[PDB]
Amino acid sequence: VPISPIETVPVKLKPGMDGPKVKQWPLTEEKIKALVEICTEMEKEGKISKIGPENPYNTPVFAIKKKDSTKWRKLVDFRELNKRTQDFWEVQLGIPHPAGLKKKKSVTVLDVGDAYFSVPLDEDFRKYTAFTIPSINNETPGIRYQYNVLPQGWKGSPAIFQSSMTKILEPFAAQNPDIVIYQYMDDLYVGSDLEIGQHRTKIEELRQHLLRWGLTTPDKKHQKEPPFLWMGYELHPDKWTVQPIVLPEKDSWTVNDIQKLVGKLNWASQIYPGIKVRQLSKLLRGTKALTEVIPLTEEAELELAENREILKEPVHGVYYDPSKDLIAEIQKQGQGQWTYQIYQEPFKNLKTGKYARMRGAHTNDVKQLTEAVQKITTESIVIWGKTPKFKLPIQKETWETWWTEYWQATWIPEWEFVNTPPLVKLWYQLEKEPIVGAETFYVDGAANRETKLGKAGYVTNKGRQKVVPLTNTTNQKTELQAIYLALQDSGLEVNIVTDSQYALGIIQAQPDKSESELVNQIIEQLIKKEKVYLAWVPAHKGIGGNEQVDKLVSA
């Protein structure tokens, strides 16, 4: 019969600050009757206790009557006490992901919400939860009260509640390896793969173990139906999915009309293959006010239409099985978009997703795939505790040629080539040594800082030359225009000498798509060529050719 206590957790207010000193709000006659009634039973139970005039601390108190519901409930306002309490280790950061669960033959739910108050508070802190109950017509002193348990709405109540619930369950979960118990607020989820008879048997051992500390649970009835709804998901005995994602059939799409459809499509994207949100996010990436009817690009209409074909036929994801291997497949969608499906068995996806390129000036496919892969590796470690084996759209030879020559250290975990629709590849490859028999083009460009007038040209070893005038340009643009002129007038194999550190940087990164049409034109030219050798020489010193063109492009 003797129940053992629940160790108290020493608490403290922020260093240098004091307790709260807020005034009480003048309540109406009816309300006061409610509060007095409430505070009466609560004092009986143990929840609170009356205090003398010593306690200088006071916290506002209200009472609200839930519309179309009998009786009321007090609501203490700890807004101020919270801003003066220390910090706690919030272990309530993020929840599990369905796809990481493993099916169970039986699964029960216990409601431990009733034990949120059976958890004592720190003695030397109770004096901070003081509050006053104004009396009728204020012709008497209001009744004072202080808490002896975890207040509903205090900063560290959840934190203290969870830590204590754990310590108690610890011994049990240790001596019952055949059962699993997830803890999350007012609900305890227990499950196990065994006889439906023996399951409800061990459930009682739990209910009874919780008894040894006093904690009691409301056990009776049966809330069974596969349509388990939890944190936005829809769990079933052996599959899951997102709650019905309804695509607003509206005509006038304001800011929140799309922005609330962005966060909503991203949610659905963890299981429906193909969702796209690029053309949509690019419509409110920089808009004014919270809402505003903004016209949708023609591109944000053809994908949103492919959303109603993907979001047409409900799709379901399975559950994780430790024994089978874990595979990951990636696909290239375009405009810097990629999709991935993770699974163990063909067509039985555990989950799915997308990757968006990082906003940059230049970029290439291989760099993006790596980024997408590192992102899937980290997500899998989080959900399954291990790195999946990859199936990618890139030949083994293409990868080796790349890593061995990239100026950076790079790496991809174990993987295999999959011959699907498109194929990531290298568009062009620069030589390491000059080409014998190829014409040599000495290029140069330059602009006037004020007039914005520049020239871009070149001279070769065969006597060919050219200089073109430009208006409204910088030095950087002129140096690129010059590389381009050479690439257009040269044959299949060519040697190019420049003094532009700026140009060399753009090209040694080996981009295959860019924001600047000038860089894109260069790419197109590099692709048609068979061998291009790009060499650099210091500026404003006698290198010649670069020194001769440099003169023609100046003044």
Partner 1 sequence: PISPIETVPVKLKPGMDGPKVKQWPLTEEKIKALVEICTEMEKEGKISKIGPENPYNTPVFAIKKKDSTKWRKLVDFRELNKRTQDFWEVQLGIPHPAGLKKKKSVTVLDVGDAYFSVPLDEDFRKYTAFTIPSINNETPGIRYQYNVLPQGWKGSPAIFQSSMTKILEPFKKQNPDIVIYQYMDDLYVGSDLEIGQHRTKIEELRQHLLRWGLFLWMGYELHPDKWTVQPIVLPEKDSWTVNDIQKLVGKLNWASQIYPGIKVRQLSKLLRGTKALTEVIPLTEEAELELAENREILKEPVHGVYYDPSKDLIAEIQKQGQGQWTYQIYQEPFKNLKTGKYARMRGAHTNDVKQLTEAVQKITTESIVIWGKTPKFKLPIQKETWETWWTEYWQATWIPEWEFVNTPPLVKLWYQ
Ligand X SMILES: COc1c(C)cc(/C(=C\CCCc2nnc(C)o2)c2cc(C)c3oc(=O)n(C)c3c2)cc1C(=O)SC
- How many helices (H) and strands (E) the chain has is answered by 15, 22
At closest approach, how far in Å is the CB of 476 from partner 1?
Answer: 15
444 is in an annotated binding site: yes
Q: Is-contact 434 415, C-beta < 8 A?
A: no
If binding is defined by CB under 8 A, does position 11 make contact with partner 1?
Answer: yes
State the binding partner of 387 from partner 1, ligand X, none, CB within 5 to 8 A by kind: partner 1
State the binding partner of 109 from ligand X, partner 1, none, CB within 5 to 8 A by kind: ligand X
State the binding partner of 189 from partner 1, ligand X, none, CB within 5 to 8 A by kind: ligand X
Q: Nearest-5° angle of CA 199, CA 204, CA 206?
A: 95
193 is in an annotated binding site: no
Task: Give dist(CA 313, CA 325) in Å, integer.
Answer: 28
Q: Is-contact 172 209, C-beta < 8 A?
A: yes
Residues 193-252 that bind ligand X (CB under 6 A): 223, 228, 230, 235
State the binding partner of 191 from ligand X, partner 1, none, CB within 5 to 8 A by kind: ligand X
Residues 81-120 as x/- pattern, contact with partner 1 by CB under 8 A: -----xxxx-x-xxxxx--x--------------------
Q: Is-contact 99 383, C-beta < 8 A?
A: yes
Phi, psi (degrees; rounded to nearest 5) at 468: -120, 135
Sign of CA dihedral 481, 482, 484, 488: positive
If binding is defined by CB under 8 A, does position 404 make contact with partner 1?
Answer: yes
Closest CB to ligand X among residues 180, 467: 180
If binding is defined by CB under 6 A, does position 63 make contact with ligand X?
Answer: no
Task: Give dist(CA 538, CA 453) in Å, integer.
Answer: 24
CA 128 to the chain's CA centroid: 38
Quick one: which of 182, 322, 461, 538 contacts ligand X (CB under 6 A)? 182
If binding is defined by CB under 8 A, does position 501 make contact with partner 1?
Answer: yes
Q: Is-contact 438 531, C-beta < 8 A?
A: yes
Closest CB to partner 1 among residues 24, 475: 475
Pair of tokens at residue 484: 């381009």
489 is in an annotated binding site: no
If binding is defined by CB under 6 A, does position 191 make contact with ligand X?
Answer: yes
Quick one: which of 135, 163, 266, 521 contacts partner 1 (CB under 8 A)? 163
Beta bridge partners of 107: 191
Task: Give dist(CA 298, CA 36) in Å, integer.
Answer: 64
DSSP structure class, residue 542: S
Closest CB to partner 1 among residues 49, 86: 86
DSSP structure class, residue 422: S
Residues 72-131 that bind ligand X (CB under 6 A): 96, 101, 103-104, 107, 109
CA distances from 364 to 73, 369, 420 (A): 61, 9, 19
DSSP secondary structure, 285-321, as one string: TT-SSS----PPPTHHHHSTTSHHHHTTS---B----
479 is in an annotated binding site: yes
If binding is defined by CB under 8 A, does position 414 make contact with partner 1?
Answer: no
Task: Give dist(CA 443, CA 129) in Å, integer.
Answer: 79
- Whose CA is closest to 341, among 439, 395, 273? 273
At closest approach, how far in Å is the CB of 256 from partner 1?
Answer: 30
Binding residues, by number, are: 111, 186-187, 444, 479, 499, 550
Binding residues for Mg(2+), by number, are: 111, 186-187, 444, 479, 499, 550
Q: Which residues bind ligand X (CB under 6 A)?
A: 96, 101, 103-104, 107, 109, 180, 182, 189-191, 223, 228, 230, 235
Q: Which residues bind partner 1 (CB under 8 A)?
A: 9-12, 86-89, 91, 93-97, 100, 156, 159-160, 162-163, 166, 182-183, 370-371, 374-375, 377-378, 381-387, 403-405, 407-411, 434, 436, 440, 442, 459-461, 495, 497, 501, 504-505, 508-509, 533, 535-538, 541-545, 547-548
